[model samples]
Target: QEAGGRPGADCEVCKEFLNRFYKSLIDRGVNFSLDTIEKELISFCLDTKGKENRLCYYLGATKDAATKILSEVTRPMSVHMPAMKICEKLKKLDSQICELKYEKT
Candidate 1:
């Protein structure tokens, strides 16, 4: 269970959110297109709130975000990188990213 390949449960929000976004890409027939990926990501960010909204900010997916790292997500995903791995990359960009957690039910 100590495999270092996967992120821990603390990254649940990041994992599930990005995983669903990836599914959206598949459903929309994005075809790994970078522009389409960015468009979809930005659109997806619209519905996010709280920690998930912060996640979008860190990813540069929101309009008001200062940085524009959305390409970091789109490019790697274009090459078939998993959402977890993509989250790992974002964590490297801004540690605060993985620090965002979901609210308990």
Candidate 2:
């Protein structure tokens, strides 16, 4: 039951997407603690619930700041919501995550 029609398996596209997502966080100048990143990475992988494990690898390979961003973006969300709420939640999460990292260091 993956998002796309591909098998419920992990693929390169997902790997690259996670990589790019992490890179964007670094480019944005977030500052996260190593401990926080490691904990969050584990949380994210477990949260994926067998979808794609690449996110864990990506977090492990990336810097703390990048991991923070990925964690925030991957946070759980409600199924019922208007488009506006969805967009707003994402924006708010982005800002809050970034600020969290920035404030850490």
Candidate 3:
């Protein structure tokens, strides 16, 4: 019966974690261009008209997902080559997705 179906939906830690995650992504360099990353994140998470608000939500969600995934996979024996290849593929996919959205609008 919860919105996210998670127990800590309204918790402060959850909010802070998401906030920190987004900030880190922006501060750190990822493969995608910052503008493209910001746009995609907003389109995926929030329904806002203003670019600023949408940007904030997008960054937050992206940060959260990135943090979670990294935490799960980052280890001494982890095979990063596969991840690097996947990231390259994702970069292309992300670009295509952005173009498609632009064409549609």
Winning candidate number (lDDT):
1
Runs with alpha carbons beyond 4 Å of true place in candidate 1: 1-10
On TM-score, the candidate that comes out on top is 1
lDDT of 3 by residue, 5-101 (tens): 3321122223222333344343554313544444444443454334333333222434553443333222211222233233233334333211212
Residue pairs with clashing backbones, model 2? none
The Cα local distance difference test for each model comes to 0.67, 0.36, 0.32
Worst 10 residues of 2 by lDDT: 96-105
The C-alpha local distance difference test score for the whole of candidate 2 amounts to 0.36
Which lDDT tens digits does candidate 1 get at residues 35-78?
87777777877777776666787777765584468777777657
Residue 65, candidate 1: Cα error in Å is 1.2
lDDT of 1: 0.67
Which is the winner by TM-score between candidate 2 and candidate 3?
A: 2
- Model 2 TM-score (2 dp): 0.29
